[PDB]
Amino acid sequence: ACRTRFAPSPTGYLHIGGARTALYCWLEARRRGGQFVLRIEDTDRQRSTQAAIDAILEAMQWLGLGYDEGPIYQTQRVARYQEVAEQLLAQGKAYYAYETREELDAMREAAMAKQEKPRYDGAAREQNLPYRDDPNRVIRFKNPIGGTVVFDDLIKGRIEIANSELDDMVIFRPDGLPTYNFAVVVDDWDMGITEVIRGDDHINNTPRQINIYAALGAPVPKFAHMPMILDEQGTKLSKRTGAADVMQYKDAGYLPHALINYLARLGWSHGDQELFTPQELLDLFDVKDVNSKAARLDMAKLGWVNQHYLKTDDPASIAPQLEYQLAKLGVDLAAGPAAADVVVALRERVHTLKEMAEKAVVWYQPLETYDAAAVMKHLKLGAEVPLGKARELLAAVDQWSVDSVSAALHDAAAALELGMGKVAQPLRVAITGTQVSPDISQTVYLAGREGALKRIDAALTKIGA
């Protein structure tokens, strides 16, 4: 079948470019009814703390990228790395060497001076049955002496690299742990990986890994190497530079799919199409078709597509995510409007769900403060009269609703031979305390029957004083 993986080197969280890598590995698998696995490099026993790897698991969780297998931990496979090196040894396809760090520097110094790229000359390739003390003990892989290794990278095409300028790499360390390159091969092979989608730093490594597959007698995966993402200014985006954490987009209150749409479009396209559903991406995405030049961030673009989905999605889909942003502010939700009803009111006025909750709190708690400017729209007494009328009729039929309040409010503005301009203006100050809110029916409605009536009286008893 198709087997992809996402194997991140645990930092504090899931970096946005990791998210994209994971997205593509996830689509490639799902698309063909394949399996998508997740590995975790927890060999440091620091860095990878449970909070650090939960920040990854929860990041993937929120985005919707689920894995058929794992998370499968590098610590669980220490002795598996150990045994495959020993197998490689017994088969004469890897050797030990014992050069000191001082000795190795001498070779980097002797190599760079000739204008040749530093290698480890095969000084121990045919000999010692070493072992023991000498903490410089390293197991090195016998990389083929001559020729080339070549692979059809699905993105970058034919890459051919010569076996000269690929040295006999260390594959197993003195601390009982594999070198990076060996492990990814041991991992990919043991996990049946068929398509290895990764950033283009590792393109130089691929040939080494290929030669290790070959010695192992293992199927070589297809490789897909992509230009990693650029900073909004232009710098390359990375963990050392102050990178965008994906979870900061949950808290900023962008919709999850809005982001995977946003991500997908960095470095991939389908002619003129900018908005894909979860299906449109399964059906149309190909990892072949990712653009050979690096895509750049555009938080402006993100803002738009987030609004499109705010506007266009089912408000019930958005309801629980608003309840995330609302709950953050200390709100007792059970005593307020439905989140979905708020969505409908605010979705065309706000760019993020955090903007929305900030603007919706007025509905969800009492009306403690009034903007002084806006109360000088009670100024007249003749504010008492429209509010009193609003109040009378806002005792509307047991169907309390946007529509139900509109008619009531339409019927109050007439009883006074006034524009709805005049009934609504102070009524906005009564239930909001400010001159700004959605259309009055929406806002009168979001307070609830009880809440409006309380709020109106509260304004009325203030005006009578």
Side-chain angles (χ1 to χ4, degrees):
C2 200
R3 305 264 289 180
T4 57
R5 85 299 187 271
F6 176 60
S9 325
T11 67
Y13 46 75
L14 185 77
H15 168 217
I16 232 185
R20 182 189 68 156
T21 308
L23 214 202
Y24 291 7
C25 297
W26 182 89
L27 297 153
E28 283 293 327
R30 291 292 108 119
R31 174 162 67 156
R32 344 223 201 209
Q35 303 89 297
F36 162 73
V37 331
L38 165 68
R39 260 149 40 196
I40 300 293
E41 185 197 339
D42 63 348
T43 30
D44 212 289
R45 301 174 302 285
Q46 297 267 205
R47 235 135 301 194
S48 58
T49 47
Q50 187 61 218
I53 103 191
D54 278 332
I56 294 157
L57 292 175
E58 292 184 336
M60 277 177 69
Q61 189 60 73
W62 175 64
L63 288 177
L65 309 159
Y67 35 98
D68 305 85
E69 311 186 19
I72 160 157
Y73 293 114
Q74 267 218 335
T75 64
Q76 273 145 215
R77 317 211 324 121
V78 167
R80 175 52 178 164
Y81 301 129
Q82 218 282 268
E83 82 177 57
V84 182
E86 274 163 331
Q87 177 178 148
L88 274 164
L89 260 65
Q91 296 183 189
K93 312 192 130 175
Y95 56 104
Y96 295 103
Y98 283 107
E99 288 79 346
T100 37
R101 189 70 264 188
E102 289 87 358
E103 283 186 80
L104 265 273
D105 293 6
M107 301 171 59
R108 184 191 322 109
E109 284 295 348
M112 87 72 49
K114 301 187 196 296
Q115 208 87 163
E116 293 182 49
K117 271 53 72 190
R119 287 174 34 262
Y120 171 83
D121 57 22
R125 198 194 223 208
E126 314 284 4
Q127 27 189 262
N128 48 21
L129 30 192
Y131 224 159
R132 256 219 112 240
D133 253 4
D134 291 42
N136 317 283
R137 88 122 97 70
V138 280
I139 293 172
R140 290 183 195 270
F141 180 63
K142 298 197 188 177
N143 209 277
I145 25 59
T148 55
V149 44
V150 72
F151 63 89
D152 287 296
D153 191 56
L154 303 169
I155 291 154
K156 315 230 154 158
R158 295 262 317 292
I159 248 70
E160 231 201 63
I161 302 199
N163 271 318
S164 72
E165 103 215 320
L166 244 47
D167 71 330
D168 294 352
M169 85 202 75
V170 181
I171 52 172
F172 205 72
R173 284 184 259 163
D175 66 352
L177 254 29
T179 206
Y180 176 103
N181 283 313
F182 186 50
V184 62
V185 171
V186 183
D187 294 334
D188 286 351
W189 172 42
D190 284 355
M191 303 200 188
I193 303 308
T194 70
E195 210 185 307
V196 184
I197 296 148
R198 67 181 104 155
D200 69 7
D201 345 313
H202 302 99
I203 196 160
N204 294 252
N205 296 166
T206 301
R208 286 173 187 270
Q209 290 166 26
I210 304 190
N211 290 347
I212 301 167
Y213 282 121
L216 260 34
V220 307
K222 310 310 294 181
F223 300 87
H225 284 265
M226 58 222 265
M228 271 298 213
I229 302 88
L230 288 151
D231 183 276
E232 199 170 331
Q233 297 274 60
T235 299
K236 217 214 72 163
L237 200 72
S238 38
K239 17 280 169 223
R240 207 266 163 273
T241 197
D245 167 16
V246 302
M247 285 288 87
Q248 261 142 33
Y249 295 89
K250 192 180 181 199
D251 296 308
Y254 293 92
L255 294 169
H257 188 71
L259 201 72
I260 75 179
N261 191 349
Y262 171 82
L263 280 177
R265 277 305 334 288
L266 303 208
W268 176 88
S269 19
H270 188 86
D272 41 12
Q273 189 169 1
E274 293 280 350
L275 286 145
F276 305 80
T277 65
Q279 208 72 48
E280 285 175 302
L281 286 185
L282 279 182
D283 294 339
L284 305 185
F285 183 82
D286 199 5
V287 75
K288 273 98 154 172
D289 313 339
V290 2
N291 306 16
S292 284
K293 202 72 218 198
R296 188 192 273 179
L297 266 56
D298 211 322
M299 207 78 151
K301 281 194 212 270
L302 178 57
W304 163 259
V305 31
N306 191 55
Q307 162 133 119
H308 175 250
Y309 290 151
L310 253 26
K311 211 315 192 168
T312 209
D313 282 341
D314 189 328
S317 188
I318 301 173
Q321 305 197 251
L322 177 61
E323 302 200 15
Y324 182 88
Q325 299 295 341
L326 270 179
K328 290 165 90 217
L329 280 39
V331 77
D332 187 67
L333 208 151
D341 286 343
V342 185
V343 177
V344 170
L346 273 49
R347 64 192 175 175
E348 317 195 56
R349 324 184 93 245
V350 307
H351 273 281
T352 80
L353 280 85
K354 194 192 234 272
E355 205 193 341
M356 210 159 87
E358 282 179 14
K359 290 195 182 185
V361 265
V362 73
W363 312 125
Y364 274 102
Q365 46 144 321
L367 224 279
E368 289 191 330
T369 35
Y370 294 74
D371 197 287
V375 299
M376 313 165 196
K377 279 243 264 46
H378 291 164
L379 88 177
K380 355 188 55 177
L381 295 318
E384 39 156 306
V385 214
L387 279 157
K389 258 294 165 171
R391 208 215 171 287
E392 283 188 359
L393 288 93
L394 268 322
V397 278
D398 203 54
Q399 298 316 107
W400 169 262
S401 61
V402 204
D403 268 355
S404 172
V405 331
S406 174
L409 288 176
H410 270 70
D411 290 24
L416 306 161
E417 169 158 339
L418 275 165
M420 184 113 148
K422 221 288 180 53
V423 173
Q425 270 180 317
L427 188 51
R428 199 192 316 287
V429 190
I431 100 299
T432 298
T434 74
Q435 287 173 48
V436 189
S437 68
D439 79 72
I440 196 65
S441 295
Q442 277 294 169
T443 107
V444 139
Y445 171 65
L446 289 171
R449 185 193 290 95
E450 66 296 346
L453 279 96
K454 195 184 186 307
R455 275 146 192 245
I456 305 191
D457 289 352
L460 252 16
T461 65
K462 272 158 192 60
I463 324 200

